[PDB]
A = this chain, B = another copy of it.
Amino acid sequence: AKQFLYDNLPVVETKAGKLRGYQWEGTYIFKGIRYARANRFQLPEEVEPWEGVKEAASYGFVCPMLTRDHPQGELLVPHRYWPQDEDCLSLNIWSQSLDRSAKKPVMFWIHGGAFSMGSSIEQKAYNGENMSRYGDVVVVTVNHRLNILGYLDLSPYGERYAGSANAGQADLVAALKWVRDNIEAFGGDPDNVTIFGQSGGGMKVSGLMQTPEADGLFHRAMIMSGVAGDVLPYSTGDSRPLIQAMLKELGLAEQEAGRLETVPYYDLAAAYNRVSPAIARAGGYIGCTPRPDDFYKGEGPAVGFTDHAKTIPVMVGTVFGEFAMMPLPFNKETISEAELDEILDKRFQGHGKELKTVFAEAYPGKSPVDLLTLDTIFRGPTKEFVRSLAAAGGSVYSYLFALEFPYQNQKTAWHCSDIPFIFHNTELVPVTNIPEISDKLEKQMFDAVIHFVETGDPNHLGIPQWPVSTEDREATMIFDRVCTVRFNFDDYLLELYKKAL
Contacts and interface: CB of A to CB of B under 8 A. Distances in A.
Interface of A: 1-7, 22, 24, 31, 55, 57-59, 68-75, 80-85, 266, 406-409, 426-427, 430-431, 433-439
Nearest to A29: B430
B59 A75 contact: no
A7 B74 contact: no
Contact of A85 (B31, B68, B72, B426): B68
Contacts of A74: 31, 57-59
- Nearest 10 A-B pairs (CB), nearest first? A58-B74, A4-B433, A1-B433, A69-B83, A4-B430, A81-B81, A2-B433, A1-B439, A68-B83, A57-B75
B4 A431 contact: yes
Nearest to A5: B406
Contacts of A437: 1
A306 B69 CA distance: 43
Contacts of A431: 4, 6, 22
A377 to B, nearest CB: 25
A437 B463 CA distance: 45
Query: How often does this chain occur in the complex, in copies?
Result: 2
A287 to B, nearest CB: 22
Given A6-B406, A6-B407, A426-B1, A71 B85 contact: no
Contacts of A72: 58
A409 B7 CA distance: 7
Given A2-B433, A6-B408, A58-B73, 10 more contacts: A1-B437, A4-B431, A6-B75, A7-B408, A22-B75, A22-B431, A55-B75, A57-B75, A58-B72, A59-B71
Contacts of A6: 75, 406-408, 431
A433 B433 CA distance: 28
A434 B4 CA distance: 7
Contact of A406 (B4, B68, B409): B4
Contacts of A266: 266
A464 to B, nearest CB: 23
A6 B3 CA distance: 33
Contact of A430 (B22, B71, B407, B426): B22
A407 B7 CA distance: 6
A22 B82 CA distance: 25
Given A2-B433, A6-B406, A434-B1, A71 B57 contact: no
Nearest to A72: B58
A84 B68 contact: yes
A435 B1 contact: yes
B58 A2 contact: no
A2 B81 contact: no
A31 B430 CA distance: 14
Given A84-B68, A406-B5, A24 B430 contact: yes
Contacts of A69: 83
9 contacts: A1-B436, A4-B430, A6-B406, A6-B431, A22-B430, A57-B75, A58-B74, A68-B85, A69-B83
